[PDB]
Structures are given as C-alpha cells and as structure tokens.
C-alpha cells in the first residue's frame, strides 16, 4: 500500500493564523479565542537581538504598537502580556474559527506536523520529530517564526510546538504554546550547541516493521539477541537504549507481522554493525527515525 | 533554513471531500458545485473488478443507488453519468466550500500534494511526483480512492490527480479530473505493467542545487561536461535526457548558487559513476528526483 512521511491535515490551524508586526519586525501568530500567541522577539530590532532585555523592551510597548491581521481585516489589541518566551495579545473579536484545541508539551522522539507560515500566511505543511535533543529538522525561512507545530486527534488540534530560531547545525528551536523552549536554548542571537543528537531507536524499528508490511525482508536474519546485548550496540551508535517500555509500544508491529522485537533488533544490530551494502529500505538508504510506532500504525 | 519534502495546506481540499457508496463499496468522492467525482468501480462487487463492463454494470443502476454523504448529512443524487473512468454524480445542493478551482492534466517529472482520505474523512497530506511512467509512490489502504492530488497557484486549487488502483509493484495508479488514466493503466483486476522508469534529471539537479544552498558542498568537483556527453552518461543509468529547456528551467538556481548547470552535470556524472561512498545530501544517501526546479525556488 505504501509507507509515506504524511502530515495531518492542515484546515483546522490554517484558520488560526495571523500575522503579527511589531515596528518592522513581523511574523506570525496564532489565533484562538480571544487571543493571540507569536515569539516575543518580535518586539526587538535587529540589533536587540544580540542582547535582548525581554522585560525592558516590552515596558516601550503598548497595545497600540502591536499589528495583528487576520487575511485583510485588523484586529484590535486590548492587552498584552508576556509568558516565558511567547506574547500573548488579548484582542477584541474571539476568533469564529477556533477549533477544539489543547496546548501540549511533547515528549523527545515524539512527532507532529507544521504548518510553516509566511506573513500570517499558510505556505505547506510536513512531519517532523523532536529530536531527543530537542531540536527539529524543518524548513523554516526568515518569516517563518510564529509557525506551530501540532497532532490531531479527532476533532481536537493538539498545539505543541511554536517556531523561535535557526541553529548554526542547520536546525531549529522553538517553544511549546506556554512559551518553554525545547531544550536549554534562549531567544538570543549567540552562538548555542545542541550536544550530541541521538537516533531514536523505538523509532528506527517501528519503520523497520513498516518495511516488513510493505514486503521489505531482506535485512532479515536468522539472529536473535538480548535487551542489553542489543543496548551494548546501542549506545556505541548514539542510539537509545531499548526498554520494555518500548518493547511493549512495538507490540501491535510485532503482532502483524510476526517478528518478535528482539530478532527485528538483531537485524538492526546487523545493519548498524555492517551497513546497507547499496541497498534501500522503503525507499530510503538510511536508517529513518522520524516515524513513531503510533504512525507506522496509522497508515500499514 | 532546511530542506523538506512539503505538501500545500490542504484546508481548501478538506471541504471538498465525501463519502460515495455503491453497496458495500465505499470511496471517497470531490464535491465541486452541484457535482461528485468518483472513481467508476464504486459500481463494482468485488467479482465485477475482475472483468468488468462498465456501460452494463452502470446502466443498473439508479439515482438513488448512489448514497452520498458529507459528514451526517446525505446528499439527494438528482443524476449520474460516466466520463472515462470518473463517474459524476449530480446533486441537488452547491458545495458552499467550493474553492477557485479548474482540472489540468499534470505532465510527468511535476510534482502535486495528495490528501489521502478514507470514508470520505481526510487522513493525511504528503508530496508525490508523476514519474516518467505515469504511476506515483504514494500511501493508499482500501477505500482511500478516490483521494485527490492538487496544487495551490494563490487562491485556486488545480485538481490534477484521483486516486484508482495499486500496482504490482506497489506503486499506484491513477486518473486526471475527467477520468483519463495517466499511462496505460485500466480499472480492471489483472496483472499490469509499468514500464521502466526513469529518473527526474532536472528534478535530481534541482535537488542538487538546494543542496548547496544550504551549504553541502562535498559533491562539487572541479569537471564540467557537455549536454551530449553528460546525456551519454544519463541514458545508462535510466536518466532523462537533459535538454536546453531544462537548463533554462534551473536558470534561477544556477544563478543563486553560481554554479553553472553543466558544471553541476558533471558533479552528477561523478555521484553516478563513482557513488557516494557513505555521505549523504541534505539528510539523503540517494539521489532525490521528486522535486521540481519550482519546489526548490520556493523553499529557498
């Protein structure tokens, strides 16, 4: 049938978003009920920036100072308020498109969809993962802060991830809607590391079993192994170690296809200890770790 | 900034999509104004998709045969007729959600975003590319036909793809917006052939191109080549030929990058020949055909 990275349907939080301006400095914010939410460096000039006084520059500021735009029409801000990283601007009119919606702090390794917005202005939308050091590899452009990141679960959006900054590494940072980063970075411009990334391995053998529903078998073998044996291999490779936790989470996987989890972890002790050989997987040449067992569910 | 594979905001789309039973035969349908599009086997048991006639199997059936459904509310079908392999149904109420739109035939090596639904509900939102042999790789269980692929110019959705049928090699089929099959394809249960397929070259060098926009360089050398030798070279490994249209098309990115588009020839000839000996590009250890000159320009 197909095993693809596939984002939740977006329509939902298109109609939540806005564009917010604060002198020149705009980019985008959220919309629900009767307020707005978007990084609170929109109030810093360029040069603020290097060494922002969060509370010192939000004192220069009144309602008036902030823009907010749904489509064409202007919003009025009747408040203001600044809550960790992120402003929240009271306005006048409860948004008509709200949906059931919650604010969530997700987990390391967990998975959710952005919809990476322009000017208040809905650009795409695509999968990502937070990395278990809580950065994300997405696709985000000057402007592009204010997006969120979000699950579905039926009727009600689960809002857990706001766009902040870029990392030298090619990464990005952000917040969850109360406006706590992700990991230790701050809404500065400086240097930051985000230390050693690890590769989520209940998600590497979630999409092996996707592999195997979709007739993928080759990197199967005729080992098995233990949970420390396969952890000894695990940490040498900056993977996670494996809990019955986790063991547990495969289940349904392991079920459907009749691979208990420790010969799938064999096979991958296999693949990590000699590789690929030129071969793919699902079409990939790469051990892919941005799927959660509760995706692979989803679509085999 | 990054680099994903981005699907458009599918909230337009969303408000378009029913559910279609005939029987037991449930899809899903793309209401448009006073019209449903369905793919035509809706009609059929599942002993009528080994061989059937459509004009006979069709003309059994009435109006009201035909149960139509937008979320709890059913639609009153007031007509139905067959255009190739889409059946348009007619109803007595205007979709109130019906967006700009217009029906255009995609050609292959174009990319398009699919939103995969099931029982008339949306699931999921994902990028896919019309290969060279006019089948998509995409992510499609029983009863997600009639799912739709499309692209977003501004305000005005282009419909261009309706999910049909899976193929033997698990790849998949479909028709455009007036029923037409893209490739040789019919909707009949029988073993069918795709041909080979070819690799996207403008789409490869494209990709190539985002790469170094995005600082992976590795895979520069200091060779250029010729359109016929480079062609020479593409032709072995089932590439498409490059044409002067093409190198037009990647004007844009050969001037952001300063990189001559027979210069990035020659660095692909080499990652063709030679391999990629381990290393990646922008997080991939293949080469990457399904992204358009267009994508990319609109990522960077």
Known sequence: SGFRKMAFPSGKVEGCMVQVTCGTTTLNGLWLDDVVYCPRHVICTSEDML???????????????????????????????????????????????????????????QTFSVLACYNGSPSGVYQCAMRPNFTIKGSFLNGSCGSVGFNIDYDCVSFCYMHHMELPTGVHAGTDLEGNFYGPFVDRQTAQAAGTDTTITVNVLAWLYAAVINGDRWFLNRFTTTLNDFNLVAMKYNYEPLTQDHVDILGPLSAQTGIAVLDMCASLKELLQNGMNGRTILGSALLEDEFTPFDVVRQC
């Open 51 to 109: 060494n922002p006084n969060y509370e010192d520059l939000l004192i220069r500021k009144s309602n008036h100072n902030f823009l907010v735009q749904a489509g064409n029409v202007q919003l009025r801000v009747i408040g203001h308020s600044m809550q960790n990283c992120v402003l929240k601007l009271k306005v006048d009119t409860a948004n008509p498109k709200t949906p059931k919606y919650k604010f969530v702090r997700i987990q390391p390794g």
